[PDB]
Amino acid sequence: MLLPTLERLLERCGRPIFSNVEDVRMVMASLLDISAYVDRASTKVIAKPLRRFCHKDPDTVASVMEAVPIDAAEPTHGRRAAMLLRCLPKHSCDEVIWERAVAATLAGLKSRKWDLHDYRVAMAHAGRGGRHAPALAAAAEEFVSSSARTASQSELPALLVILTSLPELKRSPCLQVAADRIVQLSEILSPAAIGQICASVNKVSFRHTAMAIALQEE
């Protein structure tokens, strides 16, 4: 609800200064509630101790997660899910919570009210886990389709990162669809952008003559 109220208590939460379980549980409930309502900078800071207690025990995660639920049609709660997956351990996490987050991400992917970085963050963390439920990647071939309809120079690096990161999408024709978009959008020569395109294409051995000539013209 209030961002600055809970930020000063992080130093007393990561270290067991507040040895009481209930006090840190209420603090973590407030932190999870505000995690949806953050800026682009405090998102990194809030997850520093929360990742540790999330790694500690799935029941500790659930005691706070049920206190503050997660919605998929809202950008802020979609983020809440994103840093949930950020803090979710790759090993000490029950597959039920993983599937619940997967369903939330599915409904959010069909919502698309989230900010542009939310999809990248959620997909990166899902790939980091990668233990179960690749069904999102399934729906991904539609989402990467929808972005391909607009596919402006700003969203193109994120779209191709999403495309070339998923193992199921490595050989999908939407790669060629975005490839022809790159040809049509060859007038944009932003160095960091083309760096991202190169870091996306090099993930696989993608070969396309039009990309080669168009990229090597400049």
Q: What angle do CA 157, 80, 22 make, to 5 degrees?
A: 150
3-class DSSP state of 99: helix
**8 Å CB contact between 141 and 174:** yes
Q: What's the gap between Cα 209 and its chain centre?
A: 32
> Do the beta carbons of residue 37 and residue 31 sit within 8 Å?
no
Task: Please name which of 68, 55, 82 lies closest in space to residue 29, comparing C-alpha atoms.
Answer: 68
Alpha-carbon distance of 111 to 123, in angstroms, equals 15
Q: Which of 86, 94, 160, 100 is nearest to 128 (CA)?
A: 86
Characterize 28-48 residue by residue with b for buried, 16 or more Cβ atoms within 10 angstroms of its Cβ, and e for exposed: bbbbbbbbbebeeeebeebbe
Range 183-188, long-range pairs (CB < 8 A, 24+ positions)? 183/210, 183/211, 183/214, 185/151, 185/152, 185/153, 185/156, 186/214, 186/215, 186/217, 186/218, 188/153
DSSP codes joined into one string, 100-160: HHHHHHHHHHTT--S-HHHHHHHHHHHHHH-SS-THHHHHHHHHHHHHHHH--TTTHHHHH
Environment class of 180 (CB within 10 Å of its CB; exposed 0-12, middle 13-18, buried 19+)? middle
Scanning the structure block, which residue is given the tokens 């790939």? Answer: 127
Q: Kindly provide the resolution of this structure in angstroms, with one decimal.
A: 3.7
Give, in order, the Cα–Cα distances in Å from 98 to each of 94, 165, 168.
7, 19, 19
